[PDB]
Motif scaffolding. Structure first.
Motif, PDB file in Angstrom:
ATOM      1  N   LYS A 176       0.841  -1.200   0.000  1.00  0.00           N
ATOM      2  CA  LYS A 176       0.000   0.000   0.000  1.00  0.00           C
ATOM      3  C   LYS A 176       0.883   1.260   0.000  1.00  0.00           C
ATOM      4  O   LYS A 176       0.503   2.220  -0.794  1.00  0.00           O
ATOM      5  CB  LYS A 176      -0.945  -0.021   1.208  1.00  0.00           C
ATOM      6  N   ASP A 177       1.961   1.285   0.728  1.00  0.00           N
ATOM      7  CA  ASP A 177       2.857   2.467   0.691  1.00  0.00           C
ATOM      8  C   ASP A 177       3.411   2.613  -0.721  1.00  0.00           C
ATOM      9  O   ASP A 177       3.467   3.776  -1.238  1.00  0.00           O
ATOM     10  CB  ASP A 177       4.005   2.265   1.673  1.00  0.00           C
ATOM     11  N   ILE A 178       3.801   1.560  -1.394  1.00  0.00           N
ATOM     12  CA  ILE A 178       4.287   1.637  -2.759  1.00  0.00           C
ATOM     13  C   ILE A 178       3.165   2.135  -3.648  1.00  0.00           C
ATOM     14  O   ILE A 178       3.425   3.029  -4.525  1.00  0.00           O
ATOM     15  CB  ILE A 178       4.924   0.287  -3.176  1.00  0.00           C
ATOM     16  N   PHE A 179       1.984   1.605  -3.560  1.00  0.00           N
ATOM     17  CA  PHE A 179       0.818   2.061  -4.344  1.00  0.00           C
ATOM     18  C   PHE A 179       0.663   3.614  -4.227  1.00  0.00           C
ATOM     19  O   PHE A 179       0.500   4.264  -5.288  1.00  0.00           O
ATOM     20  CB  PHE A 179      -0.463   1.408  -3.853  1.00  0.00           C
ATOM     21  N   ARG A 180       0.748   4.090  -3.059  1.00  0.00           N
ATOM     22  CA  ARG A 180       0.589   5.570  -2.837  1.00  0.00           C
ATOM     23  C   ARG A 180       1.658   6.312  -3.575  1.00  0.00           C
ATOM     24  O   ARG A 180       1.290   7.380  -4.167  1.00  0.00           O
ATOM     25  CB  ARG A 180       0.479   5.913  -1.394  1.00  0.00           C
ATOM     26  N   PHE A 181       2.852   5.842  -3.688  1.00  0.00           N
ATOM     27  CA  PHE A 181       3.918   6.575  -4.443  1.00  0.00           C
ATOM     28  C   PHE A 181       3.672   6.515  -5.890  1.00  0.00           C
ATOM     29  O   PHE A 181       4.040   7.469  -6.663  1.00  0.00           O
ATOM     30  CB  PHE A 181       5.296   5.964  -4.110  1.00  0.00           C
ATOM     31  N   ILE A 182       3.051   5.490  -6.453  1.00  0.00           N
ATOM     32  CA  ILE A 182       2.783   5.331  -7.867  1.00  0.00           C
ATOM     33  C   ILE A 182       1.591   6.166  -8.333  1.00  0.00           C
ATOM     34  O   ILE A 182       1.502   6.612  -9.480  1.00  0.00           O
ATOM     35  CB  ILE A 182       2.666   3.819  -8.309  1.00  0.00           C
ATOM     36  N   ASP A 183       0.644   6.334  -7.432  1.00  0.00           N
ATOM     37  CA  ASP A 183      -0.611   7.100  -7.687  1.00  0.00           C
ATOM     38  C   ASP A 183      -0.251   8.586  -7.637  1.00  0.00           C
ATOM     39  O   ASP A 183      -0.575   9.280  -6.655  1.00  0.00           O
ATOM     40  CB  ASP A 183      -1.618   6.682  -6.604  1.00  0.00           C
ATOM     41  N   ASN A 184       0.385   9.056  -8.706  1.00  0.00           N
ATOM     42  CA  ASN A 184       0.888  10.429  -8.799  1.00  0.00           C
ATOM     43  C   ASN A 184      -0.182  11.481  -8.505  1.00  0.00           C
ATOM     44  O   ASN A 184       0.224  12.415  -7.792  1.00  0.00           O
ATOM     45  CB  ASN A 184       1.434  10.594 -10.212  1.00  0.00           C
ATOM     46  N   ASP A 185      -1.396  11.346  -8.965  1.00  0.00           N
ATOM     47  CA  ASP A 185      -2.401  12.397  -8.765  1.00  0.00           C
ATOM     48  C   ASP A 185      -3.258  12.173  -7.519  1.00  0.00           C
ATOM     49  O   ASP A 185      -4.231  12.934  -7.356  1.00  0.00           O
ATOM     50  CB  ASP A 185      -3.202  12.633 -10.002  1.00  0.00           C
ATOM     51  N   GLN A 186      -2.917  11.216  -6.695  1.00  0.00           N
ATOM     52  CA  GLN A 186      -3.663  10.924  -5.455  1.00  0.00           C
ATOM     53  C   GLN A 186      -5.132  10.693  -5.698  1.00  0.00           C
ATOM     54  O   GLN A 186      -5.951  11.005  -4.805  1.00  0.00           O
ATOM     55  CB  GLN A 186      -3.434  12.012  -4.380  1.00  0.00           C
ATOM     56  N   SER A 187      -5.492  10.088  -6.819  1.00  0.00           N
ATOM     57  CA  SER A 187      -6.908   9.799  -7.094  1.00  0.00           C
ATOM     58  C   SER A 187      -7.391   8.528  -6.359  1.00  0.00           C
ATOM     59  O   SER A 187      -8.627   8.308  -6.269  1.00  0.00           O
ATOM     60  CB  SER A 187      -7.186   9.626  -8.510  1.00  0.00           C
TER      61      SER A 187
END
Ligand SMILES: [Ca+2]
Ligand SMILES: [Ca+2]
Ligand SMILES: [Ca+2]
Ligand SMILES: [Ca+2]
Length: 108
Positions: free
Chosen positions: A44-55
């Motif tokens: 989940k922490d990695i997912f948050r870094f990949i989700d550039n626009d925080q959508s």
């Protein structure tokens, strides 16, 4: 940061493996990088870094620039490779990758 979770050497190995265009395979990347061995919280922490626009979802350009989150000078994924990522993850027909879908894909 991604750096706080995966080892730099494993990231380097994963990028090396898919250097040539159309050789990226989600499952291989997740194994070589070490992502497939991480806990749900770490994924989940990695997912948050990949989700550039925080959508809350990965879509559009975030797929094309996926490798670039691991090293900023990595190549862009091809259209075929982005489709492979979506095919590997999407289970609800909305054309985007939610955090749950990401977890399921990584651990597959
Ligand atoms: Ca583990
Ligand atoms: Ca997003
Ligand atoms: Ca580099
Ligand atoms: Ca989806």
């Amino acid at each position: 940061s991604i750096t706080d979770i995966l080892s730099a050497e494993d990231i380097a190995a994963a990028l090396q493996e898919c250097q040539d265009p159309d050789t990226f395979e989600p499952q291989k990347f997740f194994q070589t990088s070490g992502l497939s061995k991480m806990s749900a919280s770490q994924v989940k922490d990695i997912f948050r870094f990949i989700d550039n626009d925080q959508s809350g979802y990965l879509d559009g350009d975030e797929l094309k620039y996926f490798l670039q989150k691991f090293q900023s000078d990595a190549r862009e994924l091809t259209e075929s490779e982005t489709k492979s990522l979506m095919d590997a993850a999407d289970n609800d027909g909305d054309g985007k990758i939610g955090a749950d879908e990401f977890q399921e894909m990584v651990h597959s």
